[model samples]
Target: GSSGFRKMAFPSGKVEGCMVQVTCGTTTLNGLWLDDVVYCPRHVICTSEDMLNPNYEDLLIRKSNHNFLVQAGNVQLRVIGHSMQNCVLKLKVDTANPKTPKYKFVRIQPGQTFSVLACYNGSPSGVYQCAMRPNFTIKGSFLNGSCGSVGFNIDYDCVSFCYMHHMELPTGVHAGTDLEGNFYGPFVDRQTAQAAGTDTTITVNVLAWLYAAVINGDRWFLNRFTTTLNDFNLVAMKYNYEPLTQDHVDILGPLSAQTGIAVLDMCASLKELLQNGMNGRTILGSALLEDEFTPFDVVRQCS
Candidate 1:
């Protein structure tokens, strides 16, 4: 249906100091001429206009539902609203070299609010603009001006967060190698071991056992001990010092039985383990849950 004309009347005292600007076709009328009871008609075409106070020293820009506000000069940028999806807020500070402006990109996650000072020490003295990527409305304000702009209805879609993983250790009991070329307990639990519990006891007992076998001239025991030590060193080197697993011990048992090494070289230093092709060493109780088990090939080769 075609709408009928609506009449709006302004009381004499109701309007003051304000002038109406209208556009129709190709002409613009800054004001309407009134004669006693009637007003003159004018035609002009005007798309849009930004009315600025011009005397204001600062600008305020607001975007509906978005917690972003830019202070334009030596600007302080903050995001105060919850994000529904991940997005990057990109800020560019106008620089002396127009070809290369100072810029920063920050990742915003859901329910996160963050603030940053965009320009420090009155950097580039010029107008600055900001916008969310992929079709968000762009808003700009002069650093020296008192007026700022605002945007509304900005939408963001989920992107990605940092990649992460978790490793699981049952009951927290684990084994580790030490500086003195010694392999100690799956100690009562990770906590007990971490507190210097039975691990020390096990270390001392094992050292004593080795001494006794050497003193008694037990060739079989000495040979087997050295073989096992070499196997542990080999696996430790292969897995970058990651703590040994039961599976690793099982694989090493066979290698120790088959390898023919002398008693004098049974124990190898941490340095020796690394120099002999082990990527690195792992300290006891400090192993991550996601550390990989040593591969069979590595065990076989080292054995």
Candidate 2:
């Protein structure tokens, strides 16, 4: 009578009064050798010693030391993978009970691994032992069939800022309304610009400085201010775009002499224009109307 056999190799150890059987007809039984260790649902194996006088609850509690017991009847096995696609296991039960019902075993599919255990609903009765084996190598050996490995995790944090905006930013994070309840540019004072005459004066003064430096042979000042004045003039002319006429050039000669002003001076005079709420457009208009010949137009119309 080929009763039962080890389906796979098992470590030589105390059996705890449990029997094992292989589904395949194999007479000789040996310890089940497993490729890996895993958690899974297992069947309860009882012995004649347990049947004669059993403490079902006590056995259940003791089994809890090595296995995670699930409630008897229709208990489900939850599986999860650790490193590979799936893990494997083999089942073995004692073939002792004459009235023992033959049951079909569930397969531990790929991408799935589960914990195994046996639990009883009623008291003091059956004694059984079961174990799970995974398809991969477990890092540790079982200690009283209860050995397991530890799990670990890792993470990190960071910050990023936009580099597109060249505008100066405030020292700290900027927020809503200022003290005056009005919006403001981050670094520049809106009110200061509003109260100050149009920056035309600065533009005009720069032009004058450049002319004065040139005529007086002030190379250092000319070199420094000429670059600045030229830049300012280019900006002014770009927006003004007025045509240059002979009349305007003649007027420029007289105006420069009379006011001791230079192209820089006239450019800077635009401060008042801005203060008066006049935009670059208005400033051009004023220049045209004030003097039939305006240098503003000359620079704009120049090739």
Candidate 3:
């Protein structure tokens, strides 16, 4: 247990894939200059209060594809060391109440990844306003090998769209706006639509707007694709949720294209998303309304 600078030379020549048994507070292994990165098979590293550059004791976890834990047998995980301002204490969704997400900590296995809405302060409802990268590498022994577990912080923040992060990511896939939505298009921008000056394309945010309505009402979306009874599954990946199905895409596509609404939010508010699907925009206060049966029938009802 030497305290001075020591070099661990492996005749096998790679400092990875072996058991590292440090004597708790007495032994320290500094392997930065080694030819390659090291991987600890069985580790007993410990740390307290010195959380800067934890790459040393860090565990490299795979970014999971599932937004919620699919199945894990009792390696339960919950929020820890997270900011008081984080969106949810646990990265889980309660089907009985989505807007009010609950996290008793879903059971996760030893080698799988999962997602949560990191909606700033981990508050229940705040996730609605923010777009978040909803995955976690692993959240155990990030305390340095405690209880047969190791460490790695959660992924990025509940953040702004079209922005990048210098934090944890969702593997090869970037973690900002819906990856498919942004990358698949050099789609017509509002600037171009404005230049046409003739009201070119219809921009829509059916899901976002509807979600706003449902979310404000304390509703939770289903865990799968959208259904007639519930569209919660439509944007289930938090606010930055993806339109993951073809039928879902059609609703966001042709249906959205029917109106002068765009998918992304802009600086100016021309129209606001209304609770009614068939007749969804209002701007009489700048906008106004509340109607039943129809837009004109709805209109006749509102006036």
Candidate 4:
């Protein structure tokens, strides 16, 4: 499972390194363990090898799937590297600071899964999530698939890839006061509209919004939040289950030449949408994928 981890969700953390022993195995560690230390907030995980540079994020990758146990100082993780449900590390996702009231860090073993935070109508408790697409096991149809009733089983290794572009976007952009005018209008889509596809303007806009949700959340709070790139990829690859092949990128045909330039024009120098109290309402990484109908109020409420 460690084969999939390549990026450190939080790369800026600085955890002091000391005596550590890395042992790998196939035996699974079911629940949470505090071997002598309980790691939380600021997920700073470095293997015995990482102890050298004292800096990681690109190492301990594909190599963690062997039988070895890593113990650093009194904070021994006793990790078993293999296809096992080994406990590599843990992080307390700061749900408190963000929209949700308060919650603790999650217990992420080798196997775990999440586009994720969607708020919709009729969900059990105003909480309906848009989860990941499985590796091609037909579950529910395209439209109304219940959460958990479908999805994939992703495994995690220590190799966390770190090339995500959560580069943030330009916000607080109101149409009336903004300078772009009609060219800078909000963009949304319906079934027919979404199915038929677009030319340049719409394509660029959807790409922009999607990029925002993928990197982190449109909301800064989620950005400040933390998790592993493996988990991040779950959101990244999941939400974007269908690949945007080169053809799709070039789907604009002649406009493909200006496609790159166009996205910049839309995002870097373009406009926003009219949600809630007219774009002023702001949006979250959470998505809304219901019927083509706005569902008005349904469109408005969410976490």
Candidate 5:
């Protein structure tokens, strides 16, 4: 349907106090429709309430889901409270079963710090939530699940956590390394082995390499590069380096091959394997699933 009157519209933008408003066009005679208008604020408004003090601190915990495969001994629980005043902080770790209310009370006076050796057992896998309650109600509440710079060190009988220690073990320990230095290792079951067959280590490593090439390539051109590689470097960037699939590789290959860049070859192969997963299927064998198998690769590959 056509209207006899001209349509009017307004621009969209921010108005008073961080509030945004759209100004529409002027009206016309008969049935008038304003031109579709959008107004965007040139600046943003923020108040004290919207801002948090740089010094204000809260309890920072590392892992939200603290689940351990085995009971730990003498592990130190970490807590961080910054810019606090005249407040006593108490630490409590609540578990689902094995009813125990273990409490570690620490006092934090004005400008003083506090930490204690907290104990946790993972005989059973369940959620363990830690709490830090302040005596006097402060400006902000306790900060949980934060990995602060000065948080406590968690110790274990086996050096690191079970998952980490297990990974650290030589490939002969069952989860063996592949030709690419990825730990394909052995699995407790066919399913577990299949899960590890994805060459996750290689794919993740390649993705990181690609991201670095894209972002850091600029530096090499200028002959000035300065950035330490870390876990954040691999995961923080915007590009998608998700686990690859065969179809993904099929598409990625021609694109890279056409680009005439050597970097594309490595990416393409990994993408293909991610899609198909280790030559169209997972490698499974009982010999590959035992602790003794860990050493097999060492003997074979090292020679």
Candidate 6:
């Protein structure tokens, strides 16, 4: 007698009232009533108990723990994810002021790390945190997925005020000098000068000072006369040269001196002589105009 009914084997050692489902790729078959004659499909079978249990090892592997590393100068944030899965990270900065905090987001791959410049506004104190995105159900371990409750304090006095500038002095000049054959005059080192800070006033020789004043367009010093004609005559007398002629002087001797030429007439004659001298014309009475004066004769006379 052929009954044509095949009995399905019940899962051995299975608890009663446990629901069993079958799946093949995306296709699924549920509601396989275990109490009645069980009909098995070609798909793999899964029980409700298996679905309810969590794998601790897999959970640990998937958990995200972000590491934070801060550096000097700018607040540098080095974020590292040690999990086996990709993570979406959000960095937040909490300021002491009541203003809203600042934030940045980044997607970090597993076992990878990145760095970012954090906001530091010289506030008295602040806080920074890195947290897993809200869509990620698994919580991260380090800093509770955020920087731990520890905050940061900023000391405004720690700032540094170092600056520099460049200025070139006239050529063949130096600054300070050493007695041991070392001359320092022209080059001005700003860094060293700034360090001294009003403790010293650098000085140079008259010639170097005059050259620098002219080169730098220092009108105050350039426009002022350093010595008068009398001072020049006093210095020249030491060298045995006849005193230089003066514009007001009467060279014709006592006769003109007795008559006393008017100062205005003398000044007019001086201007005309000066104009002729600039035009390369010799004075009327000068020996140079009579071809009697030569460079050799002057050299012999001076020598």
Instruction: Output the number of the TM-score-best candidate.
Output: 3
Two-way lDDT contest, 3 vs 6, winner: 6
Tens digits of lDDT, candidate 2, 157-179: 11110000001122212211111
Compared with the true structure, all predictions reach lDDT values of: 0.23, 0.24, 0.21, 0.22, 0.20, 0.22
Q: Among all windows of ten consecutive residues in candidate 6, which has the lowest summed lDDT? A: 159-168
In terms of lDDT, model 1 sits at 0.23
For 89-187, candidate 5 gives per-residue lDDT tens digits of 111222221221122212221111112111112111111211111111111111211101010112221111111001112222222111111222332
TM-scores for all predictions: 0.15, 0.16, 0.19, 0.17, 0.18, 0.12
Tally clashes: model 3. 25
Residue 219 lDDT in candidate 2? 25
Better of 3 and 6 by TM-score: 3
lDDT tens digits, residue span 68-163, model 1: 222323233232331111111122212122121122222322111111111112222222212211111112222211111111111122111111
TM-score: model 5 vs. ground truth: 0.18
| Alpha carbon deviation, residue 228, candidate 1 (Å) | 8.6
Relative to the true structure, candidate 2 reaches a TM of: 0.16
| Candidate 6 backbone overlaps, count | 7
Model 6: per-residue Cα lDDT over 1-303, one tens digit each: 111111111121111121122222332332111122111121112133323443433533443322222221243323232211111112221212122122211232111111111111211122121111111111112111111111111112121111000111232111211111111223221222311111111111112222222223331222222344465445434433234345313322222233243322332333232234324432321212111111121122222
RMSD of each: 29.9, 36.9, 22.0, 22.2, 28.4, 41.5
Model 1 poorest 10 in a row by lDDT: 34-43
In candidate 3 the C-alpha lDDT for residue 237 amounts to 30
- lDDT for model 3: 0.21
Q: Where's the lowest-lDDT run of ten residues in candidate 4? A: 174-183
For model 4 the TM-score comes to 0.17
Clashes of 5: 36
